[model samples]
Target: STGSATTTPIDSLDDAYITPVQIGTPAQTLNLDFDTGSSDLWVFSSETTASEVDGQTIYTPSKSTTAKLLSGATWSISYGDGSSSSGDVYTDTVSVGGLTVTGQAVESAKKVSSSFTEDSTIDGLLGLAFSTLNTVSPTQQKTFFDNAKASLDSPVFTADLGYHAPGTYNFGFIDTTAYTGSITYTAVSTKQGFWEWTSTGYAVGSGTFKSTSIDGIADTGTTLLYLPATVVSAYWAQVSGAKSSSSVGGYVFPCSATLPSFTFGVGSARIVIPGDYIDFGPISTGSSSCFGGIQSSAGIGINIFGDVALKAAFVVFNGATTPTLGFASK
Candidate 1:
């Protein structure tokens, strides 16, 4: 029988949206970041170094009757922000929402960088990208979504990421009521193990939409939108006091500056990010300068439509053939 589950975000200091996921036969529950940017279900576990554990929960494979060690297999991953983690591999039952997949690959962390070690809230990451990108060594592993797809009525999931608000993540089916108007579907290319696609163009504020083709990925794990340098300059230029701050590592502007809405094209549809959302937060504690949510994607090679952009729309990640991304106003 096909099944589905809904998740609400746990309290977080960052833009990360996490949900409870059960792993192993006894169903050890952990709060994992549902990331579309990577494909590896790695968790802080009994295998992690005690010094690195901090206050985060750990996964114990030994407690699960269905857990089986994947001999000689290991995985390591580094994120765009330089955060990294690595660990051993195990095959066990993993359940998300109400959907369950037996023999799912679960990476147990043996070591983690300071970024994860000190955060204390993130138990691990649940990679939602294509299985081909799985980092398990000796043999590649499929993600829980990949294993559950055949049984799902529709190989789809929708992400409703809100701004410091509770939003639901729906699996196996689309909840039409969650969005408004029509769902604009755009073709996606997964060659890079990401939901990569090209946007027709974009405009800063209420300016005319250019026809420039910007290639990028829809990454739920990332907190900000990253576009080409020139594009970013154009958007920030509209702000009188905006400048690239070396100390802040991005564009920061005076809190009194008037910011305009940023609009990006998705095929024939245009998704507009509100001006308020563009002002991410203060540059530093009690600082008068604020960081811009949309930054340059210069070194990253690909533009990233992260939480800042995703929060503006109801997103559907279709895993069915000819995988497509559907967006609608929330």
Candidate 2:
């Protein structure tokens, strides 16, 4: 991890609240998830009891000193991890980084799934990714960009992911001084708030991918990068003398060996994941041969790019403006 902190703990759900500029004159206070993994902002409400939730924070009129119920709209949300929650609509005073916005609409979860209940220390998530990738704005009702337009530095935003030890998440402000290699932008393909990516090719050592086209999504919730089995196998094939470890569940080579670089084409932008990522974490079973970074995920066709990739550069989830996404190196 680049930063000193690993994960930011907000402790209280109220601390997760952010005020966005709503359409009407009377703005609403909205609750958000400070997630660096996936790009979506959603809240649970009274209407969605179908969601199984646990460590959920409900917006109680008697408990909160800064918010009140709107008594009209409610919401429910789901994740890839099978977690979900429901809550009521509310308005409250919200703040982030010492900046406060009043009359913001914050969603209050009436119920939360066990995934949340198990982690009581985390109150809510503050999603700071792209608007098109956001979950809170179904039918494009509103986005983090829609709410923060008036309070941003530029139409731009950036994320710093080295806060917590193994990894922590940082939102806002792109650090231009980090990586001077190249800066690229990919056009948005969907209105969904999660960051979608198209991978052109991959490589490990001397081997190269025959078919470069692949689909991927950037997720902060996931701690490491997950590639399809086909992708992993192809990468390992490049190793001059690669060996597999049944106990380790991945391929491996000597740690001192020079692994070739892996690159992918994202529209006009090309992203190169550093070789260290393939080194992965674990040692070989025999306690001799080095281990590989790629692992097979059976039949799943999806790949989730996580902190391993985020740690290499700067990312911006600029939902507060024109809804653009930008990436660079620090």
Candidate 3:
């Protein structure tokens, strides 16, 4: 009736969490990054150049009897990190967990950016954002979730993310045991094709919570917590030797610097990000320089509550009604 997929962090501190997805008839399993930031189920495929694929697995649609090519349909997408993939489209039976969806659009990447080519573990990305954001052209296709929701008991999914550990993504049903306390639901504003919402304010360490309304998106694919320039400056100011270094491309602090925790408010619920989480590992091996996990959303225009923030709480991506986001402490 319902489906649930288990995922684990790629590494102790990598940007992604991947799950196994079965595509086509004979079911070729691919390890895909479940990204809530975009909408398109794409995979590294036979079309990808051998030199560019590196060590990643490729999806061979021809091996499946159910694979149907959508004539002239193509897709191209670029991520927040500037990495990109582009290719033709195929319609196949796609399965996540045990739930199957017929005629699901599977974008097969013919070309990929160096970032994807270099990282071999990730086969492709499964976009969980709105179907309106789907990139396939000539005829925009619906996402796996969009196609499967009608048969689900409840048109919703929950994201239970964890740091340096494994988590589960529940579809069509909410797992109350996945979180503690009650879920504080907030209305989502989907004007930007994202799970966008406005936070009442935030605080640094035990400081007073400012009432600055900050609008941002909940993105699982992103690695760091990005806020406004002013907010980032205020948070970094508390660190003893924190500075925005061009060499590091973000705020960097002393490896031993005592960092303060960051907190953000969603309606009445306050999600606190621990101090240690803000210190995103050392900049390089044996280096005294370390990159701050929280940074400014300068060029990006909108702030992003990426993996660093998401892992701190249990999130509910409710598709019923006008769409809503519910957050609770994990």
Best by lDDT: 3
Q: Where does candidate 3 clash, by residue pair?
A: none
- Candidate order by decreasing TM-score: 3, 1, 2
lDDT by residue for model 1 (184-270), tens: 998899888899988889988989998899999999899889999999999999999899988889999888887899998888888
Query: Which is better, 1 or 3, measured by TM-score?
Result: 3
Tens-place lDDT per residue, model 3, 1-330, is 689999888877756899999998799999999988999999999999788989888899999899999999999999889999999999999998898899999999999999999888899999889988999997999878889989988998888887778898888998888888989899898888899988889999999999889999999889899999999999999999999998879999999888898999989789988888777778899999999999999989889999888888999998886999989987
TM-score per model over all chains: 0.95, 0.64, 0.97
Model 1, residue 13: distance off in Å is 6.2
**Clash count, one per candidate:** 0, 60, 0
Ordered list by lDDT, greatest first:
3, 1, 2
Q: Residues 1-330, candidate 2, lDDT per residue (tens digit)?
A: 011112441321111222222212232333344554443344533333444434444334444566565666655667666777655555665554434446555655667778776754444555544544434333322344346556655545454554222223332344556455666665443445456656555655444444466666665555455677766666666667776667655566766566666655554554566676556433634454665544554534567666555555566655532444556655
lDDT value, candidate 3, whole model: 0.90
What TM value does model 1 have? 0.95
Of 1 and 2, the candidate ahead on TM-score is 1
Candidate 2 CA-lDDT value: 0.51
Give me the candidate number with maximum TM-score: 3
